């Protein structure tokens, strides 16, 4: 989706501030050339879009769209690619029209699209073009939402946008209910090793597959194991073929990051109840069981990359070695004889990664430092330590070490003799604060991770996994998640309708070999032509039992839960089923951030800003308005003097806190004196 993305900004295009309101809307010519769902939802709505599925670009740069041509009411198979203008020249039929299995419609009054984007009921002889299928007006990432036609447009926008922020888990189980777009969208994404030519498997391993073609020649496919992506995630690739198997051309031979057996897999399948539980799932919070923490269900790798370089200076050249001044030999036991750490060493927050020492020069010595050196006999140690230390809030093992050197004759920028890169990886679990979401815009952070015992278990001892909330469902108009939940329970338990007296009436248009299905069987309801209400309800009434004869879920889709905490049953049956949820890239460890005293700025004297540094929060303008409106003048004076700019005041504040005295009176900030010096510099006698 980063490819096939259509924008209007950039060079040669309109600016964001100069963006007209009319160019953000959906013109009626967008049907089949641009998705009216998938777009960013910040201050960039409609300026960035994605292509449609069946779309195509002309040699001139216009956007073509296929259409089924139809002559005399008989729908042919001649597919004609139209552009917008000759689309407007003709009249365009509907995708889901009842065709008589002979080319012709069953009603003369068909839905149709006129020239200027109008919707009419034309007689079925003026129709000269039909759509090829449904899902023509939709993008790729939006065509992977089951029951899209039941969701509102805003929540489908949020679901299609959050479907690509999912992270790759370590097990990557395929979804139960999906569309038919996972397989094609995976094997066209390029992250799956496809067999280039048909042949037989000679040898598999964890690192390479060598196949034997039909005529002599062999080819080996080198996998990528634990390669770092562009945003820290992992990119494993494992085979799925055995030793003696036979493959064909185009067959999937190795999984990718988010794939299972060929198709896409962005999350896991989890049992879910829709009850409001004790205020822990209040206002879109989510609670989970402890089974997901125990059994590594939502855990992912994260790989980070550090870097340091030994330049050359005026006084000499910085050297990479072990002889760090004034540092105990207890923390120098990890790294090897040449300074860098060894592969496999677990590091904490603040340990030494690359030993680096710089020349410093000569300075005068204070009498107290002179007397301590005279007492202890320690030498001067004229070189200064600037080593590479792992930043705050990080840990994990050390995967790889890549070192470039000047003596080994590689290309480097001028004056750099040694570049060394260390790859630290950690196995992040799930935790409270992390953000989860379904395929329908129903996001929400994790409120609490309960133990497995105090979690409302089913009628036969099975505990549920997540607990959603009811009040967020009806006022957001996305009951597609409820239909997905019911059909997920049906697809997990397995069904078998009874064809003793023929097929029942609700399953007449239901296709064959869905009259019975094994448990844990996958299905696919496509985007705009999928399950119906009568089909799903009749299929939910006949849903064969588990181990004993116990239909755990009645005909409405609900079940009689037990309270795992007190012990009594809940007095009313609760909707249960099997949803498909994904773990997002908004983890807490990239967000939690604090500062007592750290690095300061250079031009101004304010504390520096950003999570990459220690960083302080911006006490902005409206916050000053709130502090004035309360009347708290002293807190505002403190926040604007001795926490930002009073350069003689910060050391006195730290001294007063450490010694235990009262905080002294604030002075003039630095910004005001800078303003005074500028106004005096601009030939204005400010007095």
């Amino acid at each position: 989706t980063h490819k096939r993305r259509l924008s209007a900004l950039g060079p040669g295009g309109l600016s964001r501030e100069r963006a007209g309101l009319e160019v953000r809307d959906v013109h009626p010519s967008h049907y089949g050339r641009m998705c009216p769902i998938e777009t960013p939802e910040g201050p960039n709505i409609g300026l960035i879009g994605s292509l449609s599925v069946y779309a195509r670009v002309n040699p001139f740069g216009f956007i073509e769209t296929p259409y089924r041509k139809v002559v005399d009411g008989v729908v042919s198979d001649e597919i004609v690619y139209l552009t917008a203008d000759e689309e407007d020249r003709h009249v365009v039929a509907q995708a889901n029209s009842p065709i008589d299995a002979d080319g012709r419609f069953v009603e003369p009054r068909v839905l149709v699209r006129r020239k200027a984007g109008e919707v009419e009921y034309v007689p079925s002889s003026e129709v000269d073009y039909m759509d090829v299928s449904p899902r023509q007006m939709v993008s790729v990432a939006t065509a992977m939402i089951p029951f899209l036609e039941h969701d509102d447009a805003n929540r489908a926008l949020m679901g299609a946008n959050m479907q690509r922020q999912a992270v790759p888990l370590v097990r990557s189980e395929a979804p139960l209910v999906g569309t038919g777009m996972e397989l094609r969208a995976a094997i066209d994404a390029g992250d799956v090793v496809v067999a280039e030519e048909s042949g037989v498997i000679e040898e598999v391993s964890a690192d390479y597959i060598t196949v034997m073609h039909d005529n002599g020649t062999r080819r080996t496919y080198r996998m990528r194991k634990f390669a770092r992506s562009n945003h820290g995630t992992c990119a494993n690739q494992c085979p799925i073929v055995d030793a003696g198997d036979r493959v064909e051309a185009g067959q999937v031979i190795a999984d990718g990051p988010c794939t299972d057996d060929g198709e896409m897999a962005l999350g896991k399948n989890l049992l879910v109840a829709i009850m409001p539980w004790e205020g822990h799932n209040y206002e879109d919070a989510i609670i989970l069981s402890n089974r997901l923490v125990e059994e590594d269900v939502l855990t992912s790798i994260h790989i980070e990359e550090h870097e340091i370089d030994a330049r050359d200076t005026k006084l000499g050249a910085e050297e990479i070695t072990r002889d760090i001044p004034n540092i105990s030999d207890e923390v120098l036991a990890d790294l090897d004889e040449r300074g860098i750490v060894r592969i496999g060493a677990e590091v904490r927050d603040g340990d030494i990664l690359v030993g680096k020492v710089t020349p410093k020069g000569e300075t005068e010595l204070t009498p107290e430092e002179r007397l301590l050196r005279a007492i202890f006999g320690e030498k001067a140690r004229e070189v200064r330590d600037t080593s590479l230390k792992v930043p705050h809030g990080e840990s994990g093992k050390v995967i790889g070490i890549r070192v470039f050197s000047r003596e080994d004759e590689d290309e480097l920028p001028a004056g750099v003799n040694e570049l060394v890169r260390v790859y630290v990886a950690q196995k992040r679990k799930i935790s409270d604060g992390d953000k989860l979401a379904g395929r329908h815009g129903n996001k929400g952070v994790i409120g609490k991770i309960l133990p497995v015992e105090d979690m409302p278990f089913l009628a036969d001892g099975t505990p549920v996994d997540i607990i959603l909330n009811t009040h967020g469902v009806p006022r957001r108009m996305n009951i597609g998640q409820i239909l997905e939940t019911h059909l997920g329970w049906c697809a997990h338990s397995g069904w078998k309708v009874d064809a003793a007296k023929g097929v029942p009436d609700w399953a007449a248009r239901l296709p064959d070999e869905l009259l019975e299905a094994q448990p844990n069987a996958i299905v696919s309801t496509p985007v705009f032509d999928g399950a119906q209400e009568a089909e799903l309800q009749g299929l939910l009434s006949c849903t064969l039992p588990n181990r004993d004869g116990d239909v755990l879920v009645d005909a409405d889709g609900k079940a009689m839960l037990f309270d795992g905490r007190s012990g009594e049953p809940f007095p009313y049956p609760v909707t249960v089923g099997y949803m498909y949820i994904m773990k997002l890239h908004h983890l807490v460890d990239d967000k939690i951030h604090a500062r007592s005293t750290g690095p300061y700025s250079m031009i101004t004297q304010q504390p520096l800003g950003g999570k990459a540094q220690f960083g302080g929060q911006r006490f902005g303008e409206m916050e000053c308005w709130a502090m004035q409106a309360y009347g708290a003048a002293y807190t505002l004076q403190e926040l604007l003097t001795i926490k930002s700019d009073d350069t003689v005041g910060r050391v006195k504040v730290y001294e007063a806190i450490v010694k235990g005295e009262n905080i002294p009176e604030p002075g003039i900030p630095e910004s005001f004196k800078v303003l005074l010096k500028e106004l005096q510099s601009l030939c204005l006698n400010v007095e």
Binding site: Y54, L183, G190, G250, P511, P526
Partner: peptide
């Protein structure tokens, strides 16, 4: 269907579409 090593994912669709999806990176 039309991909050899595919998992059998049974569909609920009623319409038999003529045209398969094009190459997704042809643009």
């Amino acid at each position: 269907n039309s991909v050899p090593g595919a998992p059998n994912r049974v569909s609920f669709a009623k319409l038999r579409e003529p045209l398969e999806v094009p190459g997704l990176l042809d643009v």
